[PDB]
Amino acid sequence: MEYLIGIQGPDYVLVASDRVAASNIVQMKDDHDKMFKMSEKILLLCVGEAGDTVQFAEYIQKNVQLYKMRNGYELSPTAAANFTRRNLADCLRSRTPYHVNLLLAGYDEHEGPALYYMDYLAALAKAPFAAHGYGAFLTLSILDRYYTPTISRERAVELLRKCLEELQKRFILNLPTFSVRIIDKNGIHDLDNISF
Amino acid sequence: DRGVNTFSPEGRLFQVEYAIEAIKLGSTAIGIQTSEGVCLAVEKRITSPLMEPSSIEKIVEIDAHIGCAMSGLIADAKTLIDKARVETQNHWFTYNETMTVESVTQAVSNLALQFGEEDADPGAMSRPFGVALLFGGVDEKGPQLFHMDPSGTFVQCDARAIGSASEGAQSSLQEVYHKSMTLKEAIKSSLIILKQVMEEKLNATNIELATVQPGQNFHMFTKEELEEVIKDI
Amino acid sequence: RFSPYVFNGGTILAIAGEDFAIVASDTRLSEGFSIHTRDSPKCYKLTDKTVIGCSGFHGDCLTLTKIIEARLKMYKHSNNKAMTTGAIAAMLSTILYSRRFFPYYVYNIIGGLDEEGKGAVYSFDPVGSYQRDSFKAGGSASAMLQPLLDNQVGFKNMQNVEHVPLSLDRAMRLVKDVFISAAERDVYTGDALRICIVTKEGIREETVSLRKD
Amino acid sequence: TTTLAFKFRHGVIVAADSRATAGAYIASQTVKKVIEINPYLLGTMAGGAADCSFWERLLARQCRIYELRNKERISVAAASKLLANMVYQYKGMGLSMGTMICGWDKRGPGLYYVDSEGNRISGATFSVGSGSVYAYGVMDRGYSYDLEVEQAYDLARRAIYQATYRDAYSGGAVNLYHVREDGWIRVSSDNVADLHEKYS
Amino acid sequence: TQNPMVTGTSVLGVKFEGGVVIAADMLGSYGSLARFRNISRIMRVNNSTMLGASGDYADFQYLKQVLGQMVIDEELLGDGHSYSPRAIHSWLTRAMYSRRSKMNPLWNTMVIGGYADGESFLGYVDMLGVAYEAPSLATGYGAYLAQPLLREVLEKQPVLSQTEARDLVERCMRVLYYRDARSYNRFQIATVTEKGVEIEGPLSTETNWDIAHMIS
Amino acid sequence: NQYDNDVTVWSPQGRIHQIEYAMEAVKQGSATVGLKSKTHAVLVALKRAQSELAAHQKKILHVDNHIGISIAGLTADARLLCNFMRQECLDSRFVFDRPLPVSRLVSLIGSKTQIPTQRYGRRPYGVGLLIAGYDDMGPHIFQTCPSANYFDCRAMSIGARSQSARTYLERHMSEFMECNLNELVKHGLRALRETLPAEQDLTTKNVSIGIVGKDLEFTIYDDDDVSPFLEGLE
Amino acid sequence: SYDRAITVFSPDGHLFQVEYAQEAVKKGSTAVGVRGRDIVVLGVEKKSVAKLQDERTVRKICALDDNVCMAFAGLTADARIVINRARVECQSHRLTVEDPVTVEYITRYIASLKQRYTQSNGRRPFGISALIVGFDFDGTPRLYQTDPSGTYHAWKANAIGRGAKSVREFLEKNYTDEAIETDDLTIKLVIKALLEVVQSGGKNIELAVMRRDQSLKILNPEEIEKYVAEIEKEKEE
Amino acid sequence: GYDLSASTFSPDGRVFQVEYAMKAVENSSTAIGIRCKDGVVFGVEKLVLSKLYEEGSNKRLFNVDRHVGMAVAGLLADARSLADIAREEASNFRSNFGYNIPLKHLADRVAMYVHAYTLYSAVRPFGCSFMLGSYSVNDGAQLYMIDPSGVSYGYWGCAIGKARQAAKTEIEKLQMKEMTCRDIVKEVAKIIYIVHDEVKDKAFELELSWVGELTNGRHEIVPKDIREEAEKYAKESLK
Amino acid sequence: SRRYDSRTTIFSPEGRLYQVEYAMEAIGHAGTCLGILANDGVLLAAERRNIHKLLDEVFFSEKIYKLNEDMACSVAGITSDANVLTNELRLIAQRYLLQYQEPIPCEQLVTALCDIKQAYTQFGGKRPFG
Numbered sequence A: 001m002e003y004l005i006g007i008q009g010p011d012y013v014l015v016a017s018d019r020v021a022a023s024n025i026v027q028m029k030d031d032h033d034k035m036f037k038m039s040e041k042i043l044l045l046c047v048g049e050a051g052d053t054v055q056f057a058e059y060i061q062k063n064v065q066l067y068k069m070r071n072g073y074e075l076s077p078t079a080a081a082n083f084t085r086r087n088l089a090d091c092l093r094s095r096t097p098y099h100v101n102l103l104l105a106g107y108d109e110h111e112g113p114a115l116y117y118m119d120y121l122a123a124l125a126k127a128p129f130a131a132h133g134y135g136a137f138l139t140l141s142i143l144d145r146y147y148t149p150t151i152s153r154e155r156a157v158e159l160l161r162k163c164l165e166e167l168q169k170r171f172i173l174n175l176p177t178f179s180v181r182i183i184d185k186n187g188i189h190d191l192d193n194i195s196f
Numbered sequence B: 001d002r003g004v005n006t007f008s009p010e011g012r013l014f015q016v017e018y019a020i021e022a023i024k025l026g027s028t029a030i031g032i033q034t035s036e037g038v039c040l041a042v043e044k045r046i047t048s049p050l051m052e053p054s055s056i057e058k059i060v061e062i063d064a065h066i067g068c069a070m071s072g073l074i075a076d077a078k079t080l081i082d083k084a085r086v087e088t089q090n091h092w093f094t095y096n097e098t099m100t101v102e103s104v105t106q107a108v109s110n111l112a113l114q115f116g117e118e119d120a121d122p123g124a125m126s127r128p129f130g131v132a133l134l135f136g137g138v139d140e141k142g143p144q145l146f147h148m149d150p151s152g153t154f155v156q157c158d159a160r161a162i163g164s165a166s167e168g169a170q171s172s173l174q175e176v177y178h179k180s181m182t183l184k185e186a187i188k189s190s191l192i193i194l195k196q197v198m199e200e201k202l203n204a205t206n207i208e209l210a211t212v213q214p215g216q217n218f219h220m221f222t223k224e225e226l227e228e229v230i231k232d233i
Numbered sequence C: 001r002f003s004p005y006v007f008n009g010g011t012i013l014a015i016a017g018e019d020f021a022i023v024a025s026d027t028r029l030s031e032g033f034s035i036h037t038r039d040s041p042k043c044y045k046l047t048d049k050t051v052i053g054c055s056g057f058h059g060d061c062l063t064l065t066k067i068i069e070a071r072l073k074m075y076k077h078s079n080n081k082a083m084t085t086g087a088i089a090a091m092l093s094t095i096l097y098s099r100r101f102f103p104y105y106v107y108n109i110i111g112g113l114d115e116e117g118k119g120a121v122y123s124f125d126p127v128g129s130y131q132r133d134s135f136k137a138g139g140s141a142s143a144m145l146q147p148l149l150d151n152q153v154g155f156k157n158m159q160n161v162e163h164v165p166l167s168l169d170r171a172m173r174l175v176k177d178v179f180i181s182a183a184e185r186d187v188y189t190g191d192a193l194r195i196c197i198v199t200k201e202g203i204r205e206e207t208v209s210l211r212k213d
Numbered sequence D: 001t002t003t004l005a006f007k008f009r010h011g012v013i014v015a016a017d018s019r020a021t022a023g024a025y026i027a028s029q030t031v032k033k034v035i036e037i038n039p040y041l042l043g044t045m046a047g048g049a050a051d052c053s054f055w056e057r058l059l060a061r062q063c064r065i066y067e068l069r070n071k072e073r074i075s076v077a078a079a080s081k082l083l084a085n086m087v088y089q090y091k092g093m094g095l096s097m098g099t100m101i102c103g104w105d106k107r108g109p110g111l112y113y114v115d116s117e118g119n120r121i122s123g124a125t126f127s128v129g130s131g132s133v134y135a136y137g138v139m140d141r142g143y144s145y146d147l148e149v150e151q152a153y154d155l156a157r158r159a160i161y162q163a164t165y166r167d168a169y170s171g172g173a174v175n176l177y178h179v180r181e182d183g184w185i186r187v188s189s190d191n192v193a194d195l196h197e198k199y200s
Numbered sequence E: 001t002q003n004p005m006v007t008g009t010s011v012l013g014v015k016f017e018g019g020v021v022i023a024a025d026m027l028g029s030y031g032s033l034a035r036f037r038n039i040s041r042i043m044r045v046n047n048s049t050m051l052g053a054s055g056d057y058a059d060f061q062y063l064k065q066v067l068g069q070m071v072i073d074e075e076l077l078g079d080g081h082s083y084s085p086r087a088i089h090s091w092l093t094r095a096m097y098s099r100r101s102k103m104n105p106l107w108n109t110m111v112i113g114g115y116a117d118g119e120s121f122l123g124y125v126d127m128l129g130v131a132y133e134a135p136s137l138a139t140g141y142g143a144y145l146a147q148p149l150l151r152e153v154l155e156k157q158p159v160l161s162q163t164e165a166r167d168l169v170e171r172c173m174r175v176l177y178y179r180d181a182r183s184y185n186r187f188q189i190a191t192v193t194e195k196g197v198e199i200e201g202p203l204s205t206e207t208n209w210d211i212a213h214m215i216s
Numbered sequence F: 001n002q003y004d005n006d007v008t009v010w011s012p013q014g015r016i017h018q019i020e021y022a023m024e025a026v027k028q029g030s031a032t033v034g035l036k037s038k039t040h041a042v043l044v045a046l047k048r049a050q051s052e053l054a055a056h057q058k059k060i061l062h063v064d065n066h067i068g069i070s071i072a073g074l075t076a077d078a079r080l081l082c083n084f085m086r087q088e089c090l091d092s093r094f095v096f097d098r099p100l101p102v103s104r105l106v107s108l109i110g111s112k113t114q115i116p117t118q119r120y121g122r123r124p125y126g127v128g129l130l131i132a133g134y135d136d137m138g139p140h141i142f143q144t145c146p147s148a149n150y151f152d153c154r155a156m157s158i159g160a161r162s163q164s165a166r167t168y169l170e171r172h173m174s175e176f177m178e179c180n181l182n183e184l185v186k187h188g189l190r191a192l193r194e195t196l197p198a199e200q201d202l203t204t205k206n207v208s209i210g211i212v213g214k215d216l217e218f219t220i221y222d223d224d225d226v227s228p229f230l231e232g233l234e
Numbered sequence G: 001s002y003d004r005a006i007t008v009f010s011p012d013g014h015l016f017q018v019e020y021a022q023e024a025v026k027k028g029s030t031a032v033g034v035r036g037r038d039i040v041v042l043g044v045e046k047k048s049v050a051k052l053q054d055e056r057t058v059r060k061i062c063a064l065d066d067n068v069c070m071a072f073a074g075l076t077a078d079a080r081i082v083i084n085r086a087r088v089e090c091q092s093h094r095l096t097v098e099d100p101v102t103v104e105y106i107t108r109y110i111a112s113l114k115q116r117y118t119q120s121n122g123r124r125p126f127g128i129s130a131l132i133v134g135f136d137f138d139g140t141p142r143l144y145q146t147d148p149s150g151t152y153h154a155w156k157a158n159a160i161g162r163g164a165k166s167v168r169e170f171l172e173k174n175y176t177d178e179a180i181e182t183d184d185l186t187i188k189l190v191i192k193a194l195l196e197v198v199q200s201g202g203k204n205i206e207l208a209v210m211r212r213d214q215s216l217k218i219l220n221p222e223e224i225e226k227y228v229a230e231i232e233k234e235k236e237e
Numbered sequence H: 001g002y003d004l005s006a007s008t009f010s011p012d013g014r015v016f017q018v019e020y021a022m023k024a025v026e027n028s029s030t031a032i033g034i035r036c037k038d039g040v041v042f043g044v045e046k047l048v049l050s051k052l053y054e055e056g057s058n059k060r061l062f063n064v065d066r067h068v069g070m071a072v073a074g075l076l077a078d079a080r081s082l083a084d085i086a087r088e089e090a091s092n093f094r095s096n097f098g099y100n101i102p103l104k105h106l107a108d109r110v111a112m113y114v115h116a117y118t119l120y121s122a123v124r125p126f127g128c129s130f131m132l133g134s135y136s137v138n139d140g141a142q143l144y145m146i147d148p149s150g151v152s153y154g155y156w157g158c159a160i161g162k163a164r165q166a167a168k169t170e171i172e173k174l175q176m177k178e179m180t181c182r183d184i185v186k187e188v189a190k191i192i193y194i195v196h197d198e199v200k201d202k203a204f205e206l207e208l209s210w211v212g213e214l215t216n217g218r219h220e221i222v223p224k225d226i227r228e229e230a231e232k233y234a235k236e237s238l239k
Numbered sequence I: 001s002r003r004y005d006s007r008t009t010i011f012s013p014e015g016r017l018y019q020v021e022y023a024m025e026a027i028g029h030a031g032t033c034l035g036i037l038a039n040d041g042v043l044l045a046a047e048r049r050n051i052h053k054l055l056d057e058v059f060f061s062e063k064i065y066k067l068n069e070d071m072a073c074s075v076a077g078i079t080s081d082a083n084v085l086t087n088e089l090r091l092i093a094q095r096y097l098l099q100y101q102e103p104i105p106c107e108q109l110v111t112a113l114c115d116i117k118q119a120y121t122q123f124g125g126k127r128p129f130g
Ligand SMILES: *[B]([O])([O])[C]([C][C]([C])[C])[N]C(=O)[C][N]C(=O)C1=[C]C(Cl)=[C][C]=C1Cl
Pocket: C125, C126, C129, D001, D002, D019, D020, D021, D022, D027, D031, D033, D045, D046, D047, D048, D049, D050, D052, D129, D130, D169, D170
């Protein structure tokens, strides 16, 4: 069961996600990626029900890309988060609700870094850090304990590592590897996977 | 001005008669049916050396056993070809067998008079298709060539030309055709005739040729295979 | 809670031979603990080369055979030939699946001749899964018949026996025996056995008496 | 059912059992669970027999249309996505399908798991069906990208076999296929009773 | 109908040489209440065909309306074709199946009797579209109490005269009055022959109560 | 002129020029003939060939086991109407488990084909049919027209030079009822032969034959299968 | 809804609405396309000049997706509708096939949109032709042209709009393996081709390039008049 | 011009498309109805355009309900479509109200349907006139006639088609109020023979139907022997 | 009905759309309306046609419309048509704000309305907006 985490520093956002795709009692994939690139400076991280997660994430992705092609510049993180929200809320009482939980991470030339949290009901909250999954229950207090708004990117990767080590120790599920990426003024960077 | 479904005093639909005239603006295409297979040959009609000849496709595969040659307003042919393709795949889906050439031709021909402006969907067909088609293939009846025009009339032919020089080409076909003719003779015959009727000097880039045979699937001739056949002619 | 289904019983069987196919069924039509009629066979002629057996909910048996009959004519009209055994089977698969969310409560077995004149059997589940078999039992007593056929036609679990071709006269003698055995133990199977033999010469019919209790 | 597939240096191995069941009644021992979508693409079937065979046949139709319209072989990614998008509309309606889409295209050997819950994932090895857990154990202890061809055939065969032994719902025969760069080949069909004789 | 309201009980039918006879009591019951004690549950469809209905009486009246109007529509054409008993039976099979398949059945079980071209026709159709033909029929409790007597007679003698079929129907109606708590001793008998369809009634059966004094 | 483009426009003489024009489509079709005896209904058609290397257009179509048609006029309209007839026949077998009576089918065609003659932007059907059938009332030959009117016939011919064929059929019709099948088909073939230029003859390439009756489902004879009927026009 | 049949046949097989739409294309500004070896270049005329214009707002060269772009000639409002439809479609393709479109796919899509508006009630045809360029997954460069009828072909080089006849004549004599051996010469071939028809040369040529993978670069006036001088002084010699 | 559409009045307030449709009726051969003491009798001059047609082909007398007959003149395919409208209106009346449609109400309903085709460019007026006849003990004998404008009136006697006036002048000679249907059929046959122009049109069939006390209120074809006697009376009366 | 249809959405023989051109003639007769961009702002200045002595002066302008928080327009042509378009402009701008929670960029608003105007020249058989 799926884990997402985001940490926003002064000029970057760091994100990570587990790499497991599971089914019944087996891990069926150990290099799964739960991140979707929306634009040069926007990642959507999406978990939840099978089928709804990809269908929803890719629809949003394609529409964000379309906006870029029509207009010549990109949606800001905030505008993308609100677009994501409107779609999810608008479907909530429809014949096709999407059962998805999301983080949206982004860097805007003028607003700086942003991290947004959304649940399946489509409540949207901006946050300095956030997490989804059962794993969030064991890691949010580690983030409250050690996060500061000026946290450097090296220390954010350390803080991330403390959370991921806590899942190894204390969580009942076998989540042995995580995708890590950072977003800043120069776009989206892949970091090394954190593995156990 | 009158509606698109108006009859003339001779009992023809004006729009169909005018669609039939548009076929005469097309390049010449030829089909010949033999006991060893059918061949389809068509003049490309290159208008500039800057054009890529391989982007002119006037012969297309419908299914492995069925090809189609077209003449007239080529853009109109796209929905007809697509419909032939979808129908053969539906028939395979439902019945787990190949659709006969006659049956494909029939299914397409049921589109022909489906135009008009006050029975139908919010923007349905406003006019007939300006296209004639030769369907050539092999089914359990053996090799077969069928012709269809914008009236929706379709019929089997032993050999048939369509397009601009079709009279002319059809006379030469009467002259050379026989029921026991081989496929290789039909190929040569159809290129000799294209060569007569074409304004440009025939060569291996300004024509296309395809065959279907009881042995073998729809086959578009490559440049090199065209060049080989062109030597004798 | 009106139920749209009821179970009406019936046992079907088909056997492919080298140059024949047998389709057989009992003729009892039941409901609850009652018999509706002793003379309701479960086999229906489709073409000169193809017979279908249908059991289960009789309301759906009737409807589905009428739909098949209409679709055979429609095919013949648009393609100018009779449907083959194989094409009938592929078609039936799609007709069954069209009701995937309110199924035809029918077990189908097609018996006939293929395009080389060999015996062909196709067996179906109610929503349209199918395959070609060498023989197959269906319906109420299928679990009683199928093992005997596995053993005696398929030669399964036997050592030291020559795998000879199945003659018509042995297949017939098998078909009568398994139904007689089924009528001993399945309450739904009884009254009479109807056998259709499909060969190049056409389709012929035998009927054998079964127990009436 | 037990089905499995794995990518390796020489393509993709695909294997299945052949049993169908209606509750605990064995309805067939001779089901073909590997569907030939085209000469370069296989699908496997596990779950509802009608559901798998309908939707995979429909996938075959659509792949063929695609090929006629675009004048090129469909990619394994695109085939698997067509299937995923077709079944997604039906989630919640009780479809039961677990499929592997197995080919070789311009990205090389290709393997995707697709099911009626809406999953679609690429990967190196998968097993699907009620016997999958048994197959995983054996497949996982023997698998390597650098398996020789015959070692790979041996592994697939043995994994399905072991699943047929533990799982009441898997049996019959082991049917084995190999997707190579110039097309798939059917490699063998071995009855489980004959494989038992051999493995002891 | 989801919930039947006023209902009728068994309908009987038996073929005889030169025709068919059907029987049905004249009762519409409302639960256990014998509410409407003089209603006909038999319809003359046309000259060759008659219909008896069990189950919901309003649904029967709707079928009567629809089928009656169909026969009128056909007679307007005056073209030498009429619906046979078999055709009517087919139509009814389809109508009932179709209503079942919309999860909104017509809550009836019917017996179609007819005579056409020298053949007796007797057919059953139920609310689910289950339909078949047989030399005798009995819906409801008739299936348990009447049909055994019918079939036992028919085995010993498959071809009955008109007066034998009629005596046999009277015996079955008596048994039903004894043993079906929703029956009533007031019934109609309808007969179809070469000459057409006749409906007789109201009829009653004699009953014997001697067993009331054989308890001690 | 102002009255001849729209099927909704009555002329001042109480005519509809679009209906009349649609009837011209039938007069220019190749001839066909229909006739009947006490027990069989026969259709005979001439097939026109576009070139010496073309097959010859289909003129006779299967509707149901007891019904076939012959066509003259726009082929696409013939197929549309034939498909409607097929479907009405399938419906009657599905619902009533018996063949649709031929005259009821023909009433259906009349009602169907009338509708577009009264609505703006629609057009008549540009096809005439001869309909051969057998039912409880015996054999039938009916004729349908683009006007939506239809006719119950002892015999009939429509298409080009069909007047000759009608004259022949009037001349011999008192014989038709008592003819055996062979006689009846020959009479159909001779009527059809009257429609031809003096040079030309009936051949196995240009003649098509349809037969239905008491003992015989609707059957089409083409190509080599017509040779028996053509021999002994003696 | 309005269902009038707008595009109909006339005697002798003409579709007058389509021919009239082709007249609108001919009054549009000249557009030119050349397919290089590892580059593709579009250039377009004018259209009106005018010092008070914001130049950014009237480009006739448009990205459809990262790997495909287009120029058009004809009715600019009509073009905008086609361009936005093609952009939506590129995103459907990426959705359902997870590859970018080929240039041929999107060309085929545009062409069949155009064909449909010649055969559907209530609509007139689009008054545009388009030159569509880019690269396929395997690196092959591509130039396609569509016209109002819905016909489309691939070209080594081509022009549409006013003066297309003479610009095509020039390309026919000047398009050789030499003239496209490099990027600069390919770009120069387009400018020379325009400079034949371009009123007050030039000044008002807009130009854009697409390199294998590297995505659409529009050249700025400073970068253009560099090539203009570099070609004009070579033609003295 | 002012005569192309039923949605266009002329400057004198006429609807020429309706008047042209009426001309179609006036070109057709003649049909008559007569109401009498105990029912209504219809007769039609049915012109035989070819000897190849069967006796009975192209009927102009229809049953629209078991108690209602219809007699037509004009474009026959339009008349048949109107017969089907009338049939459906009768059928739907019985289904909704539970009894046989009264004649006058049936006439007024189909008249309004006819009238609806005289307002619009989207459709053309029916090219037919028709009579409706019935009888019941409660309502007596009733004969209505409806024309292409949709006007509907009741009549003692009525004629439509091309010898309309010649027919009416003969019908006026009868005291139809005091005559029975059996006497009237002969007079109907007689009048059709009077107004038939044997020079201009060579061959016709007489078609006869009736509804009255003698048919128990059912609309029926006149039996063959009565029709033959009536023709013979008419023919010898022509003398 | 084909006789009465004036065919507002078809090409003329030179590839022109006459209704569009005729509409542009109506505009050329309306009040003069100019726009001027500066470094610190933008302006609209328009001729008033509503100048009769007895007019009552009840709105804040005659031809200047606020579209949203950051935009305004002026118009030349048929006034009632302008009321329809400006109302549609306000709707588009609020649909965008709803969806993205930021104001519509200027050129995207203009483009969105222009696609409506374009559609009126291509299908529907209606007169364009003047
Ligand atoms: B396997 O998943 O165990 C197998 C795969 C298919 C392709 C054969 N599935 C089954 O056997 C599941 N059974 C059925 O779908 C079924 C249902 C019914 Cl109602 C009747 C017979 C059968 Cl086989």
